[PDB]
Amino acid sequence: AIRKKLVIVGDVACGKTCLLIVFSKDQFPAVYVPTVFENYVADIEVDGKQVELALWDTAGQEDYDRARPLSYPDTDVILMCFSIDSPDSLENIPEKWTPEVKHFCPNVPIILVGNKKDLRNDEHTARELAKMKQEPVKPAEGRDMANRIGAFGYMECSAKTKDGVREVFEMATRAALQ
Numbered sequence: 001a002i003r004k005k006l007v008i009v010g011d012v013a014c015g016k017t018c019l020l021i022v023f024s025k026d027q028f029p030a031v032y033v034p035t036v037f038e039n040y041v042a043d044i045e046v047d048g049k050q051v052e053l054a055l056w057d058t059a060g061q062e063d064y065d066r067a068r069p070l071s072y073p074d075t076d077v078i079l080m081c082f083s084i085d086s087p088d089s090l091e092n093i094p095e096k097w098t099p100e101v102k103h104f105c106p107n108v109p110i111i112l113v114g115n116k117k118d119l120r121n122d123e124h125t126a127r128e129l130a131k132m133k134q135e136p137v138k139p140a141e142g143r144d145m146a147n148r149i150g151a152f153g154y155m156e157c158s159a160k161t162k163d164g165v166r167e168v169f170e171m172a173t174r175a176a177l178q
């Protein structure tokens with residue numbers, strides 16, 4: 001049995017938990033999905049191989065700088081997230097999450113994930129961000145940040161529409177494998 005530890009990080013409310021929830025619910029046979037993910041085993045199949053993905057969610061620990069890192073030992077792949085409706089969450093990628101992850105998880109592959117891609121085209125999130133003189137993150141910006149931080153790859157998804165969720169985990173699994 002091949003088991004890979006996956007830790008997901010990113011700012012508060014950037015969609016980390018909902019991303020795990022949508023993925024866990026896509027499993028078959030259908031299982032009951034809890035609200036917390038700490039060493040939560042998800043069985044996935046990518047390229048014909050059965051893989052056990054142990055999920056670790058740092059949601060609720062974004063401000064526990066000394067406690068949060070205890071979850072990093074022996075991580076096989078990192079899902080570093082930001083929200084497309086929040087350029088502030090993207091700016092924290094190089095300023096907070098990358099230095100931390102690279103320190104505690106050296107040479108561990110990182111998948112830069114842009115959550116809430118369904119909000120990019122939302123008129124309400126466009127107005128709220130305009131008040132702060134901001135606008136949704138463009139695909140190009142995400143791809144550039146991925147290159148800058150040396151991520152294995154960049155993926156966009158939406159936990160709400162489920163678009164791109166499957167692909168995020170397939171890429172994370174391949175990275176953990178290779």
Ligand SMILES: Nc1nc2c(ncn2[C@@H]2O[C@H](COP(=O)(O)OP(=O)(O)O)[C@@H](O)[C@H]2O)c(=O)[nH]1
Nearest residue numbers: 012013014015016017018019059116158159160
């Ligand atoms: N529109 C939209 N809202 C989302 C999406 N994913 C999460 N959210 C919402 O964002 C809020 C916080 O994200 P959540 O995943 O619950 O927690 P986090 O662990 O702090 O990222 C909640 O109100 C969610 O319903 C998404 O793909 N699209």
